[PDB]
Ligand SMILES: *[C@@H]1O[C@H](CO)[C@@H](O[C@@H]2O[C@H](CO)[C@@H](O[C@@H]3O[C@H](CO[C@H]4O[C@H](CO)[C@@H](O)[C@H](O)[C@@H]4O)[C@@H](O)[C@H](O[C@H]4O[C@H](CO)[C@@H](O)[C@H](O)[C@@H]4O)[C@@H]3O)[C@H](O)[C@H]2NC(C)=O)[C@H](O)[C@H]1NC(C)=O
Ligand SMILES: *[C@@H]1O[C@H](CO)[C@@H](O[C@@H]2O[C@H](CO)[C@@H](O[C@@H]3O[C@H](CO[C@H]4O[C@H](CO)[C@@H](O)[C@H](O)[C@@H]4O)[C@@H](O)[C@H](O)[C@@H]3O)[C@H](O)[C@H]2NC(C)=O)[C@H](O)[C@H]1NC(C)=O
């Protein structure tokens with residue numbers, strides 16, 4: 340045996356909620372033909388993203404709760420664009436059955452089986468904030484240390500987020516996960532809003548209490564920090580048990596962070612599930628076809644490794660890329676649209692390799708490799724399908740011996756699915772398994788998903 344891979348289904352780790360992307364800042368409109376995409380390719384892109392059989396079967400869609408009072412440039416417009424005059428005044432809410440294209444997108448994703456919709460606000464509306472502006476950070480009026488002459492807007496913001504979730508549910512598209520901050524560290528020209536851990540915790544408790552009063556069942560998140568270390572720094576604040584004997588962590592279902600300022604390479608110190616909720620290559624490079632060339636930020640293998648590391652080393656339950664599909668020739672999205680043209684990147688195919696076979700409620704299980712040139716991850720689905728991801732970073736093909744150890748069902752067949760410079764997500768011939776062990780060659784510089792049958 341040249342390379343030994345051992346999988347142990349009796350050594351079990353975190354659950355998986357899934358994989359996906361956002362179509363925020365009007366990028367959902369691109370999929371529906373804003374820049375000339377044909378009806379054929381609109382349907383094709385939705386199948387690539389959300390069909391388990393025809394595509395990646397993404398299971399999480401992250402939508403923006405818009406803060407803007409218009410839909411100019413790439414703004415996401417708000418359900419409450421204009422101040423009601425005071426926090427206690429009756430709000431005027433507008434529902435356009437659109438949400439910058441994210442509503443019809445959510446309908447199309449759900450039609451193809453998508454279970455999880457994560458609605459996240461980048462900012463409260465400007466009139467609820469210290470700077471009276473959705474932009475350039477600022478704080479929710481009434482949060483600890485941040486008073487405003489117009490009064491305390493904390494309950495108004497909670498009621499606003501509840502009303503967004505209600506419009507979605509009433510329109511047949513329930514939201515499963517809810518967040519109220521994005522990158523609270525960042526002071527930027529676009530929708531942004533500040534909070535440290537204790538300021539975030541204060542609002543988590545108000546929002547959780549509001550949802551419980553309304554009888555709405557939804558998973559709360561915090562805080563989409565700009566990097567993994569930056570999110571870790573907020574967790575002590577979320578864990579402070581207040582006078583009432585509750586922490587923010589008691590109300591939270593998921594702790595969320597981004598990969599930009601620091602990558603998900605270590606476990607966060609929360610007792611909750613964690614999600615990597617945004618990450619991409621923002622360099623402005625264009626790397627659609629490269630799985631491996633020289634370790635560029637946009638290469639397929641870079642992203643296969645980011646995903647594998649997030650699950651094995653950072654203990655995440657989900658991985659959400661930034662934009663799925665957009666009219667651009669950069670690496671910001673997984674799928675480049677060029678008017679009526681669809682170019683799925685190797686970053687897309689790396690995501691697809693995981694997402695297609697690691698279905699919601701899968702559990703990560705122990706998987707080891709005898710050699711640092713081959714890195715491995717493994718998950719058992721609730722239907723018993725085992726999906727093993729192998730990255731071969733050798734310059735030659737690697738002959739693997741893969742032992743599945745002790746299992747309930749004797750495994751009889753396994754199917755390899757390959758992603759490389761030569762292959763997108765290519766199904767290879769089934770391999771016969773004997774005594775829960777099999778041999779497989781994997782190409783140089785490749786990702787292979789080995790998927791067990793029945
Ligand atoms: C599989 O094994 C291979 C080796 O065989 C490893 O490859 C090396 O991968 C690293 C990254 O992990 C590579 O280093 C990075 O290269 C990037 C691309 O560089 C080229 O293109 C850019 C942009 O045009 C040029 O600027 C540059 O001169 C090169 O022409 C760089 O963009 C990266 O830079 C960034 O990160 C560094 C380090 O943190 C920062 O200092 C920089 O400022 C910047 O943010 C980086 O240098 C390296 O080139 C690869 N070597 C080879 C021989 O290919 C893989 O890592 C390995 N994969 C796995 C998953 O283990
Ligand atoms: C829907 O999206 C499709 C996918 O993008 C569109 O089809 C593509 O249209 C472009 C023109 O905009 C064609 O581009 C040319 O490609 C050739 C090279 O061709 C070949 O190699 C590819 C890659 O493996 C292969 O799939 C092709 O079949 C060819 O063998 C260049 O010489 C040209 O300069 C230009 O780049 C694409 O080839 C074409 N792709 C496919 C798969 O058809 C399509 O037009 C969109 N609309 C509709 C209504 O279908």
Ligand SMILES: *[C@@H]1O[C@H](CO)[C@@H](O[C@@H]2O[C@H](CO)[C@@H](O)[C@H](O)[C@H]2NC(C)=O)[C@H](O)[C@H]1NC(C)=O
Pocket residue numbers: 407408420421422465466470471472473474
């Ligand atoms: C609509 O939103 C815009 C953008 O946030 C608001 O404009 C800002 O208002 C604040 C407060 O006066 C200023 O500090 C910013 O400079 C403004 N930004 C821009 C780009 O103009 C605007 O007030 C909002 N309109 C209403 C009616 O609420």
Ligand SMILES: *[C@@H]1O[C@H](CO)[C@@H](O[C@@H]2O[C@H](CO)[C@@H](O)[C@H](O)[C@H]2NC(C)=O)[C@H](O)[C@H]1NC(C)=O
Pocket residue numbers: 353354606607610611612613654656
């Ligand atoms: C990996 O993440 C999981 C959550 O997905 C962590 O699981 C929690 O474990 C604590 C301590 O044993 C329990 O009190 C919680 O009930 C678990 N949460 C869930 C949702 O199951 C696990 O601790 C994390 N691992 C590491 C090494 O940090």
Ligand SMILES: *[C@@H]1O[C@H](CO)[C@@H](O)[C@H](O)[C@H]1NC(C)=O
Pocket residue numbers: 374375666667668676677678
């Ligand atoms: C969409 O993307 C292509 C490629 O970047 C670009 O050339 C084109 O102008 C964009 N389409 C528009 C604005 O119609």
